[PDB]
Amino acid sequence: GRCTKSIPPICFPD
């Protein structure tokens, strides 16, 4: 579910 604070944001499978 998590997501990085970048763009495009890299979201984790969780």
- The partner residues of 3 in beta bridges, in order of sequence, read 11
DSSP secondary structure of 1-14:
--B-SSSS--B---
Q: Are 10 and 2 in contact (CB under 8 A)?
A: no
Half-sphere exposure of 13 (CA within 13 A, CB side): 0
- Provide Rg for the chain, Cα atoms: 7
- Return d(Cα 3, Cα 10) in angstroms, integer: 5
> How far does the chain reach from its first CA to its final CA, in angstroms?
4
Residue owning tokens 């579910």: 1
Distance CA 4, CA 11 (A): 6
For the CA atoms of 4, 12, 10, 2, what is the dihedral angle to 10 degrees?
-30
Tokens 């890299």 belong to 10
